Amino acid sequence: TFKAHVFDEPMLEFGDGGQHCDPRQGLREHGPLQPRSGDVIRVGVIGTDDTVAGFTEFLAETGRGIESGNKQLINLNPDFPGLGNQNPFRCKFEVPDGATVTISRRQVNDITGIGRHDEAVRHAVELISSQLSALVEGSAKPDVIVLALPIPLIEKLVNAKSGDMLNFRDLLKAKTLHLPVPTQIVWPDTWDDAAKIPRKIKRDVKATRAWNLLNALFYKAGKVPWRLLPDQAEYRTSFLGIGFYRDLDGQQLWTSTAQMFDERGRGLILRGARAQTETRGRHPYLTAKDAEDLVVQSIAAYKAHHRHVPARLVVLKTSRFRSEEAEGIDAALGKSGIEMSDLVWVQESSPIAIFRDGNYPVLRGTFVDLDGKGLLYTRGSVPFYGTFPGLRVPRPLLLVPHENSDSTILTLAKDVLALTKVNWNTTQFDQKLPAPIKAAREVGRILKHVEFGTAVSSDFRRYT
Amino acid sequence: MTFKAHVFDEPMLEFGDGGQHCDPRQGLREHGPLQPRSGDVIRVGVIGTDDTVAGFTEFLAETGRGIESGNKQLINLNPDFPGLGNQNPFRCKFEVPDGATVTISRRQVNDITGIGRHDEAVRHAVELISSQLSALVEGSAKPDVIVLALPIPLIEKLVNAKSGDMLNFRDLLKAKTLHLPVPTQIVWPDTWDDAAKIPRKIKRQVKATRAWNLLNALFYKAGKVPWRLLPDQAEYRTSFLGIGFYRDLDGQQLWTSTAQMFDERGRGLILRGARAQTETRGRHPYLTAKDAEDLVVQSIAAYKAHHRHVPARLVVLKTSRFRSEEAEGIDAALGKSGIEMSDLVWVQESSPIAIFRDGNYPVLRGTFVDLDGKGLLYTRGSVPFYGTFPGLRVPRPLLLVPHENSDSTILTLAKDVLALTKVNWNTTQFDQKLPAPIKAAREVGRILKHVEFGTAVSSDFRRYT
Amino acid sequence: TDSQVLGELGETAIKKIVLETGFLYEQRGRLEAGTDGIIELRDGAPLGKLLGVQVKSTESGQYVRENDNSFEYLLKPDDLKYWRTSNIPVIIVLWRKSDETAYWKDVSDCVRGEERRLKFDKGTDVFDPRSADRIGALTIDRRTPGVFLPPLNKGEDAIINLLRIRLPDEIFISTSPFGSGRDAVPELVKHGNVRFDWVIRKRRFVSFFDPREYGTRAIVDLDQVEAVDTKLIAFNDEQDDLNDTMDLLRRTVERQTATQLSFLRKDRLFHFKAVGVGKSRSYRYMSNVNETSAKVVSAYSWGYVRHHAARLRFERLADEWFLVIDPDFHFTTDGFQPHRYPEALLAGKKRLERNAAVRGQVTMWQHLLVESGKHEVGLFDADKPAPLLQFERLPVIQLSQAVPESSWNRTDPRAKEMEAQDL
Amino acid sequence: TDSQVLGELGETAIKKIVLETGFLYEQRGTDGIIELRDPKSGAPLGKLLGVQVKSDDLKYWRTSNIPVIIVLWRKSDDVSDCVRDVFDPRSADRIGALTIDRRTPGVFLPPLNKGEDAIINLLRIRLPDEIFISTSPFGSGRDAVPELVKHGNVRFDWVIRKRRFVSFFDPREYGTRAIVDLDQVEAVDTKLIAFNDEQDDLNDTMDLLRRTVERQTATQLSFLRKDRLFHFKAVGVGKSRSYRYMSNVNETSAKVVSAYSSGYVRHHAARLRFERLADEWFLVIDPDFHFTTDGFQPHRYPEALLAGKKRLERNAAVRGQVTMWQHLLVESGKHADKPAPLLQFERLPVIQLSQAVPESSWNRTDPRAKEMEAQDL
């Protein structure tokens, strides 16, 4: 019993039908899925005079090509071939004139000079949110805006490590959610993502960082470097994540969200009804009626932004499907007319794990059937990378399909594994959670500063 | 700063034809109830087994003949019952009219005590008893109050034991019969004291005081007034409005506000307000300024509809602190009402501040310390009338924090709280810890959590006791 | 007072005749120019019958009428009975210090009024042991419904939990790169010279000690480390600063009492630590000027080790900070590991919650807290800084009326239950 | 395997050829990779080349961007193109020229095919065929603890929730006879409670197994309510202790209690969860650590010690911990007038994987190999 399969590194389709597993190595040979001639990305910049010039220099060096940090692990730390004849994105990253707004020395000193942290974060967001709106409404017409705050301002706005207090990035994303241009907040020295995670007090990968900033810029601009290679070309499959986030204000109630993704990696975020709770405000769940409306509101939202109706729709959750929840979802699916429907409970914190002989962990893609339950290892030893990227041992995912599901747990485990390659943060493809689950955590951090009943955009690019 | 001290007199009560005394039992013995009418009878309905009904009639007859004391060394604490004849303390005949009896068969008791699931047996027991209760009230008996004398095996099945995870039989029964106008007193069929209100001990003799409390509860549950608090000025009248919260078990576990208004005759009014807000993670309940205004407006309209006299001073009480929005709405409703004087008091039941005299007996009941702007009132402790301390554990005092919007002094308010502890629907023992609005908040909140939000609930507090 | 001494001499005389007769005497309170009390019959046993007595004392000065055979006295309405509430009968005894003789009549009618004219005859009525049959006859039993036992008018004192806190006039405040104190504890333990009496909430660091000088340098932004008046943080209305003030007061109390105490995050309970596994230990303190000992750690041996504990809470009263002592207990299996099932031991604590035992616990806990802040040579300055918070006792709370204790240990049957018997 | 032997003979001959020139051969019907060596250094050049030794069924090196060569052999005596001149050592210089250019981007380092084994942290629980139940006057267990301790022969491996008693032992023969209603006690099939879909019975079964395992292992372990964490207890103060257990067919020991002086004390711990999969109950073993000031007094600040824990979360270190805990748990329930263990545990069959991590080659090629092993600071 407990038969184990080791899945293939799921395939990605790139330009002109080219296929590969690495996002970078795939873009290195075929380019993006759909290339258009003369494509250009209008990149706006906000920061000090020093940071803006630093971004212009990094963009120039990035265009000239950047050598690998460690040659021994070239697949994990590749060269950037630079903008030109070997450019993988096959698109121009430009900062046109007049698309730059600069925070003065006065303004930076005014933010740092505020003692109260909540009062200082509200003041800085108030400043930059009126600088982002001023750049969107301008004639510069940027596609993605890069926020390059100076280090002393970042250290005031981002706590460190070795909801009682406001988080800067989350509040900013909420205030600029009605704005159509996405924003990329970067460190001015390394140019990696900033304010997503707590910084390090003793903070002290160039090519890999450049790959990632450019990837983020491309996805934010609205283009797609690759789609998930489907099992059948005619078969259309969408993946809907359902989560909940608790408001810190009022009656401290729970609100249901939906994270709707397609085979190309484009998310559609929606807010559902207030959730119910089993005990003392914890254990959030949805009623049968609210569950049907959210899924109907999600299918209608997907069908608006696409051409084909998906033959199959997978619904993912991090908590068990309540029978009231499952009944409403299956009711909306039966009314939607979708051919196949699968409901999956993705457990993040299952203590079950398998251990092999030796120091290196089990291969990524290892799947062990547990009599209807599936222990999937999204993170682990990667043959392409020649090592295990992480240090702490991986903790696998227990996948529990609902009885109403139509696919086997073998096909569903492949989908979850492939869904971990949709990655708006890095170009590394060994992510722990599938895209709907990662999107659930981000939108919960942001929409909790947006009042319930207020209209929210369904564009995931604004949320990243 | 060193603080000041004061020892309050035992707040005086008024009985029949102007009589005054501090103990309810002696005042009833010396003057009778407040406003008795010639020929008062309390028609008492009974539900139970054939044995329990006969036992109740025997205890009622024993009560009429009189029961001498069982502890002569503490006579003011353990008094004899003088009987329901010439020396009738209540001047009110207690009778069980023909036909007001409903019996539970020995099979039906075994049908409930045979269900393995506790929650299932609780509901089946309420569906049984509530349907029989509906038969009496909608019948020719026309009872004034009904006594529920359940058999020992059935009580031991529905009540937990000691030395929101499951249902409580009494609260579910009160909620399911809160629409009937005839109150219900639940009694053990042996000692005839209250049952299902507090958990029972694992293993089951005061007799006259058991009779005193039962008749006092029936007198109150019948709708008559034994006594009223005696005011400092006879013409100025004060009404007391407590505000509490109770959290629901299902749905989103939302808190709901309640108001427990009491007048100087001990009569209460129970109002249900809007859903409350919370400060952090579903705890620390509070009310917005508008909803706090609606609750006070509804309560005053309820006061005006029943009591038919102009309240001069309105003391508002809460066990949680008066938040800025709550006090603003209370002020708006009070100002529009025309009440001349108003007081807001935050009663802390769980303060760790206490004083300890040199000895084994604790401090006197009525001891009050004026920590600057914060009163330390001792509602329990040594009682000179009772000649002992009517407890065992050290009494923990109430800490009274008046709001800045209050008119009266902190001394005028502590003397008010001490008086509100004499009002009792449980016993005839006058050293009760909590004032009447706070004591009712724990109680109606336990019952109203089983009556769905939105359903109009009766304001008569007698149905909640 | 001159009046109190004369009344004491009067009741002492009257107590002598009463006891010579075979009855008993106790005192209730104090009048003007006299004192009052109660007298109980006896047969060898107190019999439960009691009479009141008003002992008026005068040193000189004849009474109103010709004192050859009779006399007159007037009873002031205020000096009239305070027993007006109670339903017991009372007599009055007029004792002249210069003649050393008394006379008793019945004053059972005491309602205030001009009933003051009292007609005394020297021959008919004298308070001699010979008047015993008469005094005894005028007696209502204690076992009659309505007899008040009126409280003592003597007056007594009592202590309060609160210990006044003497805060340092200056508090160091600074911004912190870390969010919470728990987020900064990892970085603090690395540097050295580490103390933990500091609070970091919402990127704000506060402490009484200079962060720049005791190795908390990493957890603070040295640039904005600056001193400020303590009233600006403690004595404001900001709930955030009141919460930070209470957290800093706790952590400083932990440091200063660290020799004898350990802090438990569960229920925020301070308890006397154990020095030996399964080994008892005692603590010597000072109650007033008396040398005392308390078995703060009692080891029992099937193994439970009880620890003297108390919840140390902080309350502000009229721009002045006080510390509340609330005594409890903490149970351990071996002096350290908490009892796996502490629910069975909770009942024994209720038998130990009587007035005398809690008063002793509070008095002890005050002595430890007061000593923790004392500046003396007898501190462990070797490897450890000096205390900055000091704690001051409060005056005794004076009560106008007292508990009739001496009377109640005779009359009240349940008096012994007011005592706390251990296990 | 009849075919395994056929290939190894070929591999061996060609392998002796290549080492005579300093090249390397590694096993990957045989597939191998060749790495050139610099004479004086005696170290790998990094230059690789794939060799398949034989003596639509294409190579699995198809993803690999590696030059592929095939060797032809017989018992008696460049194929970089994939579609639907001798080995005399002079050839070696020539074959070397077809390097893969070392770490050129796109090299795959593909996983081994032979397969390998793996263990699971699950243990099958063998439950007593019957379970006793009853009603109780008490609401929960915390209400019944005061009454139970007033009588002799006390045990705690029982559950009371919503006035329903459950236990694997008969409650009428212990002090539990005072916390149960005595006429309602009755033994029934254990599946009536432990193998149904009611969440309350599913909960009460998990609490019973938790409370029974606690009693069964009271000698070596202590239970802490925070995180429901079992940990190896200590004897003495600051004194380390070792636990002796069987791994594979061998004997070994582990420092379950660790100390470090300048203090604090480490304790080998485990979260012991329960997971029913298909009408069988399993005990899950999640290894962790628990820290104390001196053996018994809990530590004041766990956060300074949590940083060192994630330096010890390495596969070999954690695997050896599950191997230990299973031995302690299976050994606990073993062996006319005294009671015996109620629960037994069974190791599960080893998990067989169709592909293996090339740890031997990866330890040489990967410059991060040493970090994969737990250094105990």
Short mmCIF file of N, CA and C in Angstrom, two decimals, chain B residues 1-3 5 7 21-22 26 29 71-76 352-364 367 369 371-372 374 376 382-385 387-394 396, chain C residues 142-149 151 156 158-162 164 315-318 320 324 326 353-356 358-359 362 394-395 397-400 402-403 405 408-409 412-415 417-418:
data_model
loop_
_atom_site.label_atom_id
_atom_site.label_comp_id
_atom_site.label_asym_id
_atom_site.label_seq_id
_atom_site.Cartn_x
_atom_site.Cartn_y
_atom_site.Cartn_z
N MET B 1 -1.36 59.82 48.23
CA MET B 1 -2.41 60.28 49.14
C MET B 1 -3.01 59.14 49.96
N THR B 2 -3.21 59.39 51.25
CA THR B 2 -4.01 58.49 52.07
C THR B 2 -5.49 58.76 51.86
N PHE B 3 -6.29 57.70 51.92
CA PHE B 3 -7.68 57.75 51.51
C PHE B 3 -8.61 57.84 52.72
N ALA B 5 -12.60 56.90 54.59
CA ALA B 5 -13.42 55.72 54.82
C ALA B 5 -14.77 56.13 55.40
N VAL B 7 -18.64 53.92 56.77
CA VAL B 7 -19.37 52.67 57.00
C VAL B 7 -20.86 52.99 56.87
N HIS B 21 -37.77 48.81 58.20
CA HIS B 21 -36.85 47.83 58.76
C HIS B 21 -35.87 47.43 57.67
N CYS B 22 -34.69 46.96 58.09
CA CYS B 22 -33.63 46.62 57.15
C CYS B 22 -33.72 45.20 56.63
N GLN B 26 -38.04 40.19 58.67
CA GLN B 26 -38.66 40.79 59.85
C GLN B 26 -39.68 41.85 59.46
N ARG B 29 -42.71 40.31 58.63
CA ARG B 29 -43.34 39.76 59.82
C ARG B 29 -44.02 40.83 60.65
N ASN B 71 -31.75 26.79 63.66
CA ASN B 71 -30.51 27.27 64.28
C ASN B 71 -30.88 28.47 65.15
N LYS B 72 -31.16 28.19 66.43
CA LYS B 72 -31.65 29.22 67.32
C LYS B 72 -30.56 30.20 67.75
N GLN B 73 -29.28 29.83 67.59
CA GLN B 73 -28.19 30.72 67.97
C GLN B 73 -27.95 31.82 66.95
N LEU B 74 -28.47 31.68 65.73
CA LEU B 74 -28.40 32.72 64.70
C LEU B 74 -29.82 32.96 64.19
N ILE B 75 -30.67 33.51 65.06
CA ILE B 75 -32.10 33.53 64.80
C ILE B 75 -32.44 34.52 63.68
N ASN B 76 -31.74 35.66 63.63
CA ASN B 76 -32.01 36.62 62.57
C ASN B 76 -31.49 36.14 61.22
N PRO B 352 -8.84 43.88 42.07
CA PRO B 352 -7.96 43.24 43.06
C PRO B 352 -7.69 44.09 44.30
N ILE B 353 -8.26 45.29 44.39
CA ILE B 353 -8.05 46.15 45.54
C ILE B 353 -8.98 45.72 46.67
N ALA B 354 -8.42 45.53 47.86
CA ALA B 354 -9.19 45.09 49.01
C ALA B 354 -8.51 45.57 50.28
N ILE B 355 -9.27 45.59 51.37
CA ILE B 355 -8.76 45.96 52.68
C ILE B 355 -9.01 44.81 53.64
N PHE B 356 -8.08 44.63 54.58
CA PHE B 356 -8.11 43.50 55.50
C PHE B 356 -7.94 44.00 56.92
N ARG B 357 -8.96 43.78 57.75
CA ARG B 357 -8.87 44.13 59.16
C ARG B 357 -8.04 43.09 59.91
N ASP B 358 -7.80 43.37 61.19
CA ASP B 358 -6.98 42.50 62.03
C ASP B 358 -7.92 41.55 62.77
N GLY B 359 -8.10 40.36 62.22
CA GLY B 359 -8.98 39.37 62.82
C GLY B 359 -9.35 38.31 61.81
N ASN B 360 -10.27 37.45 62.23
CA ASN B 360 -10.75 36.38 61.36
C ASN B 360 -11.99 36.78 60.57
N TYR B 361 -12.94 37.46 61.22
CA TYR B 361 -14.09 37.98 60.50
C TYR B 361 -13.65 39.06 59.52
N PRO B 362 -14.25 39.13 58.33
CA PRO B 362 -13.90 40.20 57.39
C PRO B 362 -14.49 41.54 57.80
N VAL B 363 -14.38 42.54 56.92
CA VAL B 363 -14.85 43.88 57.22
C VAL B 363 -16.37 43.93 57.15
N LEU B 364 -16.96 44.99 57.69
CA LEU B 364 -18.41 45.11 57.76
C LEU B 364 -19.01 45.34 56.38
N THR B 367 -18.84 48.89 54.30
CA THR B 367 -17.55 49.56 54.34
C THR B 367 -17.21 50.11 52.96
N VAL B 369 -14.43 52.80 50.81
CA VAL B 369 -13.20 53.58 50.77
C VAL B 369 -13.24 54.48 49.55
N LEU B 371 -10.98 55.86 47.41
CA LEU B 371 -9.87 56.08 46.49
C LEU B 371 -10.29 57.19 45.54
N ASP B 372 -9.41 58.17 45.35
CA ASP B 372 -9.80 59.41 44.68
C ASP B 372 -10.56 59.15 43.38
N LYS B 374 -12.70 56.85 42.87
CA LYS B 374 -12.93 55.42 42.67
C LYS B 374 -13.32 54.81 44.01
N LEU B 376 -14.45 51.95 46.71
CA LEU B 376 -14.27 50.54 47.04
C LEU B 376 -15.38 50.14 48.01
N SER B 382 -19.11 40.94 56.99
CA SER B 382 -19.73 40.77 58.29
C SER B 382 -21.01 41.60 58.39
N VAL B 383 -22.07 40.97 58.88
CA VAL B 383 -23.38 41.60 59.00
C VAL B 383 -23.76 41.64 60.47
N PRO B 384 -23.93 42.82 61.07
CA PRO B 384 -24.34 42.86 62.49
C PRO B 384 -25.72 42.28 62.73
N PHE B 385 -26.65 42.47 61.80
CA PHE B 385 -27.99 41.90 61.96
C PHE B 385 -27.94 40.38 61.98
N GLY B 387 -25.33 38.63 62.76
CA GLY B 387 -24.47 38.18 63.83
C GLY B 387 -23.32 37.29 63.41
N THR B 388 -22.96 37.31 62.13
CA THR B 388 -21.87 36.50 61.60
C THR B 388 -21.55 36.99 60.20
N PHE B 389 -20.64 36.28 59.53
CA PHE B 389 -20.35 36.52 58.13
C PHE B 389 -21.07 35.46 57.31
N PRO B 390 -22.08 35.81 56.50
CA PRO B 390 -22.89 34.79 55.83
C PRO B 390 -22.17 34.10 54.68
N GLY B 391 -20.91 33.75 54.88
CA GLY B 391 -20.15 33.06 53.87
C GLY B 391 -18.95 32.36 54.46
N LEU B 392 -17.98 32.06 53.59
CA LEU B 392 -16.75 31.40 54.00
C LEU B 392 -15.55 32.11 53.41
N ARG B 393 -15.53 32.22 52.09
CA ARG B 393 -14.44 32.84 51.35
C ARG B 393 -14.37 34.33 51.70
N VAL B 394 -13.19 34.91 51.53
CA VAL B 394 -13.05 36.35 51.81
C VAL B 394 -13.89 37.13 50.80
N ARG B 396 -14.78 39.83 48.18
CA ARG B 396 -14.01 40.69 47.31
C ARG B 396 -14.85 41.89 46.91
N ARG C 142 -31.25 36.35 73.50
CA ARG C 142 -30.63 36.49 72.19
C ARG C 142 -31.40 35.70 71.14
N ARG C 143 -32.00 34.58 71.54
CA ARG C 143 -32.73 33.70 70.64
C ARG C 143 -34.16 34.17 70.38
N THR C 144 -34.36 35.47 70.19
CA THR C 144 -35.65 36.04 69.86
C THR C 144 -35.55 36.79 68.53
N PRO C 145 -36.55 36.64 67.65
CA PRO C 145 -36.45 37.24 66.31
C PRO C 145 -36.50 38.76 66.37
N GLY C 146 -35.44 39.39 65.87
CA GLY C 146 -35.37 40.84 65.80
C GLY C 146 -34.23 41.46 66.59
N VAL C 147 -33.54 40.70 67.43
CA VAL C 147 -32.44 41.25 68.23
C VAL C 147 -31.28 41.59 67.31
N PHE C 148 -31.01 42.88 67.15
CA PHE C 148 -29.80 43.31 66.45
C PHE C 148 -28.60 43.14 67.37
N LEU C 149 -27.49 42.70 66.80
CA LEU C 149 -26.23 42.84 67.51
C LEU C 149 -25.54 44.04 66.90
N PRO C 151 -23.09 46.92 65.70
CA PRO C 151 -21.63 46.86 65.57
C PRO C 151 -20.94 47.77 66.58
N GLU C 156 -11.69 50.86 64.27
CA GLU C 156 -10.54 50.00 64.04
C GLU C 156 -9.88 50.39 62.73
N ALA C 158 -7.28 49.12 59.20
CA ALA C 158 -7.07 48.05 58.24
C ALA C 158 -6.06 48.52 57.20
N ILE C 159 -5.48 47.55 56.49
CA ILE C 159 -4.47 47.82 55.48
C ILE C 159 -5.07 47.60 54.10
N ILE C 160 -4.46 48.24 53.10
CA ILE C 160 -4.90 48.13 51.72
C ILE C 160 -3.79 47.48 50.90
N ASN C 161 -4.18 46.86 49.79
CA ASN C 161 -3.21 46.20 48.92
C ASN C 161 -2.14 47.18 48.43
N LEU C 162 -2.55 48.40 48.10
CA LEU C 162 -1.74 49.28 47.28
C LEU C 162 -0.38 49.59 47.92
N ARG C 164 2.48 52.43 47.08
CA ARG C 164 2.78 53.60 46.27
C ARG C 164 4.12 53.42 45.56
N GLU C 315 -2.25 50.02 39.28
CA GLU C 315 -3.43 50.87 39.22
C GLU C 315 -3.02 52.31 39.50
N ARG C 316 -3.50 53.23 38.67
CA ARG C 316 -3.20 54.65 38.83
C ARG C 316 -4.38 55.35 39.50
N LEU C 317 -4.09 56.13 40.54
CA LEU C 317 -5.11 56.84 41.30
C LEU C 317 -4.67 58.29 41.48
N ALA C 318 -5.37 59.21 40.81
CA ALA C 318 -5.17 60.65 40.97
C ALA C 318 -3.72 61.05 40.74
N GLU C 320 -1.00 59.24 40.42
CA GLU C 320 -0.13 58.57 41.39
C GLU C 320 -0.27 57.07 41.18
N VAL C 324 -0.89 46.71 43.22
CA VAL C 324 -1.88 45.91 43.93
C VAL C 324 -1.32 44.51 44.14
N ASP C 326 -2.34 40.76 45.00
CA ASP C 326 -3.47 39.83 45.00
C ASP C 326 -2.92 38.41 45.17
N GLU C 353 -8.46 30.93 52.08
CA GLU C 353 -8.86 32.29 51.78
C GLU C 353 -9.72 32.83 52.92
N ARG C 354 -9.07 33.08 54.06
CA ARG C 354 -9.68 33.76 55.19
C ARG C 354 -8.91 35.04 55.47
N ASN C 355 -9.55 35.94 56.22
CA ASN C 355 -9.05 37.31 56.35
C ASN C 355 -7.63 37.35 56.89
N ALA C 356 -7.35 36.56 57.93
CA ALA C 356 -6.04 36.64 58.57
C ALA C 356 -4.93 36.14 57.65
N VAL C 358 -4.85 36.07 54.25
CA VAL C 358 -4.60 36.98 53.13
C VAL C 358 -3.92 38.25 53.62
N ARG C 359 -4.29 38.73 54.81
CA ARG C 359 -3.61 39.88 55.39
C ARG C 359 -2.13 39.60 55.61
N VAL C 362 -0.34 39.54 52.09
CA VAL C 362 -0.13 40.89 51.56
C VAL C 362 0.99 41.59 52.32
N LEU C 394 1.41 52.30 52.58
CA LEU C 394 0.34 53.27 52.71
C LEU C 394 -0.16 53.31 54.15
N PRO C 395 -0.70 54.45 54.60
CA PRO C 395 -1.24 54.52 55.96
C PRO C 395 -2.41 53.57 56.15
N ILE C 397 -6.00 52.28 56.88
CA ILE C 397 -7.33 52.82 56.64
C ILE C 397 -8.12 52.74 57.94
N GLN C 398 -8.62 53.88 58.41
CA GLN C 398 -9.28 53.98 59.70
C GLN C 398 -10.79 53.85 59.52
N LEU C 399 -11.39 52.91 60.23
CA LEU C 399 -12.83 52.66 60.16
C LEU C 399 -13.52 53.27 61.37
N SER C 400 -14.67 53.90 61.12
CA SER C 400 -15.41 54.55 62.21
C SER C 400 -16.00 53.52 63.16
N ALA C 402 -16.25 49.17 64.25
CA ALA C 402 -15.43 47.97 64.27
C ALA C 402 -16.29 46.71 64.25
N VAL C 403 -15.66 45.60 63.90
CA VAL C 403 -16.35 44.31 63.85
C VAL C 403 -16.44 43.74 65.26
N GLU C 405 -15.80 41.28 67.07
CA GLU C 405 -15.14 39.98 66.98
C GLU C 405 -15.17 39.24 68.31
N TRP C 408 -18.39 37.83 68.97
CA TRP C 408 -18.90 36.85 68.02
C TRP C 408 -18.27 35.48 68.19
N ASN C 409 -17.05 35.40 68.71
CA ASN C 409 -16.45 34.10 68.97
C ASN C 409 -17.15 33.36 70.10
N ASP C 412 -21.57 33.57 68.04
CA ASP C 412 -21.72 32.96 66.72
C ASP C 412 -21.19 31.54 66.72
N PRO C 413 -22.01 30.54 66.38
CA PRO C 413 -21.50 29.16 66.35
C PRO C 413 -20.44 28.93 65.28
N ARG C 414 -20.53 29.59 64.12
CA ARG C 414 -19.61 29.30 62.98
C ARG C 414 -18.33 30.13 62.99
N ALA C 415 -17.94 30.64 64.15
CA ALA C 415 -16.77 31.53 64.24
C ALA C 415 -15.48 30.81 63.85
N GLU C 417 -14.98 28.59 61.73
CA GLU C 417 -14.89 28.45 60.26
C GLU C 417 -14.30 29.73 59.66
N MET C 418 -14.34 30.85 60.39
CA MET C 418 -13.67 32.02 59.83
C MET C 418 -12.15 31.87 59.83
#
